[PDB]
RNA sequence: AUGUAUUAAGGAGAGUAUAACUUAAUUUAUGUUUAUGAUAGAGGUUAUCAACAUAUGAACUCUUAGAGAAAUUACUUAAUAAACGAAGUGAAUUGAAAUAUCUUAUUAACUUCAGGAAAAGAAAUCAAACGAGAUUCUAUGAUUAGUGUGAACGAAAAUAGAGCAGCCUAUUAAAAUAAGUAAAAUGGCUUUAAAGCUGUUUGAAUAUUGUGGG
RNA sequence: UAGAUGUGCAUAGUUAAACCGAUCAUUAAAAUAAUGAAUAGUGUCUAAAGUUAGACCCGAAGCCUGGUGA
RNA sequence: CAGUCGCGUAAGCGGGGCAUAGGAUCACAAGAUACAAAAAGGAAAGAUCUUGGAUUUUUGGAAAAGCUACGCUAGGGAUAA
């Protein structure tokens, strides 16, 4: 999220490691539909491969 | 015959009430002294503590200065004071804390368990009974002991007298070897009775039995459920692909 | 008398203990089998030492290299595959996959980098089966099809072969499709399973892709080729003619 | 010797009921249970013939105000060892059957700083086309990959066990997301040539709508 | 109850190595032309051993670091 | 034995010299081989075969001067006073 006043790209609140622990913890209780868009989402990982491939 | 019968008795009266059938590879194995030896000796290496320790010349206290000059004094040239040749020097190859336990194949350890269980079966020293294998202590004594009227000195003095005269009538006491009672769970009357009168036998829990404990007394008095769980946990060599394990031939006449 | 006082190991198991330095009559007395005042008596000689003469590995040198990238296949022959079916340890009616080849014991208790089907005993093999392995010899591919069976060579790794035995990955004889006309159907399947299954990897390197791209190995990527097309990703079949 | 639990500043001088400990050197009170305990008397020096639990009086001098030849002076309700930890500096014996690179060795030692522990820590991490998901401790992986003329030195992924915890609104108060920085040349360190540390001289870019590191 | 999990060795040989495979390697194309290599392992105990550790025991002169003493 | 060349009518001979007196590995360099390529496509650095430069002349392959009557230690006394 680029800051308006400072023009600096604030690092995401949850790091890519922690984003994978939320997607892995949410998928255990069937709550993966409530998390916002994440590259670690199991559906995003699969969709990106089928769409574009290697 | 492939299978061998096992008569189940009622413990107090020893009345044959049921008949079970086990395979010959469970209670009719040949007597292998070499395999029974490896197992009994494999259990002794595990119960050993092996904490003995000794100080070498590199651990004995003191300074590592040279005692006497290399030459000039006329006496034998000496180095440090912690050498084994000195009075308070260290033992070179002395004991040290290490592990004495050895290894024994699970299949060879199970064959040794069923060989010690068959050595008792063929000699008639394996007396299986029904469940609830506890000493039938008199009801009056149990009512007084639980109530608290009886002091400890009398509560113990009675258990010792009754267990001695109860085991002598059965020819199961010190005058005839001894007996070992193996039960699944801990029963107060039994385990407490053989804690005050130990000369008449002992009691053990299924998990507290070794191959050396089956061979250490005159007789083995085991429960039906205990035996079915004892031979079912030590048939690794057999169950590899079943055999008769508790097959009932004559049912208890309810 | 007592049993515990009458046990012992067979005499053939016990051997003499040689305690050196315990008298002349023992036979290992003063010198302790060391000789008389040499280097082997006072100290220790380096094992690699030859007295000064250069070793042959320094006079000739080490020959070759050790390939650290080669795959460690789990060799499987047809002579042994037929024995497991006659014994009832492998169901020939169902597809024989690495999960059922590793759990049966035919290849052993070690999961290596793959499974290759070889052609030992290919003359007495007449059981129609549907097997799937990582590789197969030329004599094992035609021996499986001569009896009326089907064989397919898929791409596996050491990690993917372990997930198949653990049930963390479902086996499939097809590669992952590519394109936007497959997302709706592939994503549909994932939700229905109601579990987190891992996907089997597809080849990425040139050699790996080419091996499973030709029909000679019955590769599962052979359907991507045209009859005149070659498996190699670089070379092409030249055209015969005068022009 | 190992394991478990608990605890986290140590010593000396002199004096004193010689089991009793501080010039008060055997203080004074509470509650409970007392032979079915706990684990119908004699006895205050002919003593402490009562254990548990909770309180309580007193507790000198030096180390340890300043000075000095510590336990003195002179004043005053002046007061904290060792081992363990991090960083800095950094050998030699030894092996290579000599010996320079190397090994011994990110060792011993010393120096500073800090706490009951410290350090480290929630990926500019590893993986390889599948994915894993902070740090620390133990074993395997591994006399392996690799390095080196050699002698020798020596990972990581992963697996198992001990513990498990995540966050910035950190349960104790911290960022308006990082510029002389990343990086380059050169001199060294570490090491496999990468990554990492560094003196000198120089010197970038701004997010997957593909900017930056590996 | 049910399913999974936890080092390893052997089951296939061959070459420097992969491909290959009861066949493989050299023969700059291949081919019985020649030559070599093919079939019970694994665990445990008792004993003797190789390797690395003080390494069967005792014994130097010396070298380095930190301190002490006029 | 395979490959393919010379000489000879032919048989056949030829893998230097009538015989006996010219050292490897490592590194480095020039050709071939198509083996492996540390995410992947290449490459670098490796691997096989052929070959070259050596008083590597201590020629099974260290880059190497002396003194000690002030000498030290461990030994032998291969005779050294
Ligand atoms: K010997
Ligand atoms: K001698
Ligand atoms: K040398
Ligand atoms: K190596
Ligand atoms: K670097
Ligand atoms: Mg010393
Ligand atoms: Mg001693
Ligand atoms: Mg033993
Ligand atoms: Mg012998
Ligand atoms: Mg002799
Ligand atoms: Mg000898
Ligand atoms: Mg000798
Ligand atoms: Mg030499
Ligand atoms: Mg002072
Ligand atoms: Mg003072
Ligand atoms: Mg390790
Ligand atoms: Mg940043
Ligand atoms: Mg830098
Ligand atoms: Mg880079
Ligand atoms: Mg960097
Ligand atoms: Mg092999
Ligand atoms: Mg590459
Ligand atoms: Mg790379
Ligand atoms: Mg020579
Ligand atoms: Mg010679
Ligand atoms: Mg002589």
UniProtKB/Swiss-Prot annotation, chain A:
Alphabetized GO MF terms: structural constituent of ribosome
Report the principal subcellular site. mitochondrion
Q: Which domain of life is it from?
A: Eukaryota
User: In which compartments does the protein localize?
Assistant: Mitochondrion
Provide this UniProt record's keywords sorted from A to Z.
Mitochondrion, Ribonucleoprotein, Ribosomal protein
GO cellular component assignments: mitochondrial large ribosomal subunit
Q: What does this protein do?
A: Component of the mitochondrial ribosome (mitoribosome), a dedicated translation machinery responsible for the synthesis of mitochondrial genome-encoded proteins, including at least some of the essential transmembrane subunits of the mitochondrial respiratory chain. The mitoribosomes are attached to the mitochondrial inner membrane and translation products are cotranslationally integrated into the membrane.
**Homology family:** Belongs to the mitochondrion-specific ribosomal protein mL59 family.
| Subunit organization | Component of the mitochondrial large ribosomal subunit (mt-LSU). Mature N.crassa 74S mitochondrial ribosomes consist of a small (37S) and a large (54S) subunit. The 37S small subunit contains a 16S ribosomal RNA (16S mt-rRNA) and 32 different proteins. The 54S large subunit contains a 23S rRNA (23S mt-rRNA) and 42 different proteins.
Name of the protein: Large ribosomal subunit protein mL59
Species of origin reads Neurospora crassa (strain ATCC 24698 / 74-OR23-1A / CBS 708.71 / DSM 1257 / FGSC 987)
Which gene name does the record give?
mrpl25
Covered range within the whole protein? 56 to 109 of 163
UniProtKB/Swiss-Prot annotation, chain B:
Top-level taxon of the source organism: Eukaryota
Q: Which UniProt keywords are given for this protein, alphabetically ordered?
A: Mitochondrion, Ribonucleoprotein, Ribosomal protein
> Does the record bear rRNA processing in its keywords?
no
Q: Where in the cell is it found?
A: Mitochondrion
Q: List the GO terms this entry assigns under cellular component, sorted alphabetically.
A: mitochondrion; ribonucleoprotein complex; ribosome
Residue ranges of the region described as Disordered: 52-97
Molecular-function annotations in GO: structural constituent of ribosome
Task: Give the principal location in a single coarse category.
Answer: mitochondrion
* Keyword Hydrolase listed: no
What are the BP-aspect GO terms?
translation
On subunit structure and binding partners, the annotation says: Component of the mitochondrial large ribosomal subunit (mt-LSU). Mature N.crassa 74S mitochondrial ribosomes consist of a small (37S) and a large (54S) subunit. The 37S small subunit contains a 16S ribosomal RNA (16S mt-rRNA) and 32 different proteins. The 54S large subunit contains a 23S rRNA (23S mt-rRNA) and 42 different proteins.
Q: Which family does it belong to?
A: Belongs to the universal ribosomal protein uL4 family.
Functional summary from the UniProt entry: Component of the mitochondrial ribosome (mitoribosome), a dedicated translation machinery responsible for the synthesis of mitochondrial genome-encoded proteins, including at least some of the essential transmembrane subunits of the mitochondrial respiratory chain. The mitoribosomes are attached to the mitochondrial inner membrane and translation products are cotranslationally integrated into the membrane.
- Recorded protein name is Large ribosomal subunit protein uL4m
Name of the coding gene: yml6
Within the intact protein, the region shown is 62 to 324 of 325
Curated annotation (Swiss-Prot), chain C:
Q: Which domain of life is it from?
A: Eukaryota
| GO MF, any single term | structural constituent of ribosome
Instruction: Give the compositionally biased regions (Gly residues).
Output: 24-36
The biological processes this protein is annotated with in GO are:
translation
Major place of residence:
mitochondrion
- Identify the stretch(es) annotated as Disordered: 17-43
Its keywords, alphabetically, are: Mitochondrion, Ribonucleoprotein, Ribosomal protein
One Gene Ontology cellular component term attached to this UniProt record is: mitochondrial large ribosomal subunit
* Subunit and interaction comment: Component of the mitochondrial large ribosomal subunit (mt-LSU). Mature N.crassa 74S mitochondrial ribosomes consist of a small (37S) and a large (54S) subunit. The 37S small subunit contains a 16S ribosomal RNA (16S mt-rRNA) and 32 different proteins. The 54S large subunit contains a 23S rRNA (23S mt-rRNA) and 42 different proteins.
Q: Which family does it belong to?
A: Belongs to the universal ribosomal protein uL15 family.
Function, as annotated, reads: Component of the mitochondrial ribosome (mitoribosome), a dedicated translation machinery responsible for the synthesis of mitochondrial genome-encoded proteins, including at least some of the essential transmembrane subunits of the mitochondrial respiratory chain. The mitoribosomes are attached to the mitochondrial inner membrane and translation products are cotranslationally integrated into the membrane.
Name of this protein: Large ribosomal subunit protein uL15m
Phylogenetic classification of the source organism: Eukaryota, Fungi, Dikarya, Ascomycota, Pezizomycotina
Q: Which residues of the full protein are shown?
A: 47 to 289 of 312
């Amino acid at each position: 999220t680029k800051h308006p006043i400072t023009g600096k790209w604030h690092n995401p609140k949850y790091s890519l490691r922690r984003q994978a622990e939320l997607v892995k913890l949410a998928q255990e209780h069937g709550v993966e539909e409530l998390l916002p868009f994440t590259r670690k989402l199991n559906e995003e990982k699969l969709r990106k491969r089928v769409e574009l491939g290697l | 015959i492939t299978n061998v019968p096992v008569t189940v008795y009622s413990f107090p009266e020893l009345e044959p009430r049921s008949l079970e059938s086990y395979s010959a590879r469970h209670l009719h194995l040949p007597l292998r002294r070499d395999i029974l030896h490896l197992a009994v000796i494999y259990e002794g290496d595990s119960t050993r503590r092996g904490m003995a320790s000794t100080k070498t010349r590199y651990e004995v206290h003191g300074s590592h200065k040279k005692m006497s000059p290399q030459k000039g004094t006329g006496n034998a040239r000496r180095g440090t004071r912690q050498s084994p040749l000195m009075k308070g020097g260290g033992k070179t190859f002395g004991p040290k804390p290490r592990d004495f336990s050895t290894k024994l194949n699970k299949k060879v350890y199970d064959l040794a368990w069923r060989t010690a269980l068959s050595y008792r079966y063929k000699r008639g020293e394996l007396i299986v009974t029904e469940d609830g294998l506890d000493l039938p202590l008199p009801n009056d004594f149990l009512w007084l002991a639980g109530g608290g009227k009886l002091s400890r000195e009398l509560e113990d003095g009675y258990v010792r007298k009754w267990v001695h005269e109860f085991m002598t009538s059965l020819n199961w006491g010190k005058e005839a070897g001894r007996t070992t009672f193996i039960t699944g769970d801990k029963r107060p009357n039994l385990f407490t009775g053989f804690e005050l009168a130990g000369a008449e036998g002992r009691a053990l829990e299924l998990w507290d039995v070794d191959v050396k404990d089956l061979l250490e007394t005159g007789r083995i008095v085991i429960e039906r459920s205990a035996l079915k769980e004892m031979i079912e946990d030590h048939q690794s060599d057999l169950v590899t692909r079943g055999p008769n394990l508790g097959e009932v031939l004559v049912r208890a006449p309810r | 008398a007592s049993i515990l006082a009458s046990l012992s190991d067979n005499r053939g198991a016990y051997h003499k203990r040689i305690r050196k330095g315990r008298g002349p009559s023992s036979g290992y007395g003063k010198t302790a089998g060391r000789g008389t005042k040499g280097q082997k008596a006072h100290g220790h000689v380096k094992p690699w030492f030859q007295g000064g003469q250069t070793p042959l590995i320094v006079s000739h040198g080490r020959k070759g290299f050790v390939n650290q990238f080669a795959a460690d296949m789990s060799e499987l022959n047809l002579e042994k595959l037929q024995e497991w079916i006659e014994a009832g340890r492998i169901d020939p009616t169902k597809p024989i996959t690495p999960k059922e080849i590793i759990k049966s014991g035919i290849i052993g208790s070690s999961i290596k980098d793959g499974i290759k089907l070889l052609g030992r005993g290919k003359e007495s093999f007449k059981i129609p089966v549907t097997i799937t392995v990582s590789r197969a010899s030329a004599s094992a591919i035609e021996a499986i099809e001569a009896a009326g069976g089907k064989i397919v060579t898929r791409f596996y790794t050491k990690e993917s072969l372990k997930r198949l035995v653990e049930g963390k990955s479902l086996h499939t004889d097809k590669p992952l499709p590519v394109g936007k006309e497959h997302v709706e159907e592939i994503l549909a399947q994932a939700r229905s399973l109601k579990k987190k299954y891992y996907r089997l990897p597809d080849p990425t390197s040139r050699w790996d892709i080419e091996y499973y791209r030709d029909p000679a190995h019955r590769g599962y990527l052979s359907h991507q080729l045209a009859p005149g097309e070659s498996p190699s990703l670089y070379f092409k079949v030249p055209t015969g003619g005068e022009k």
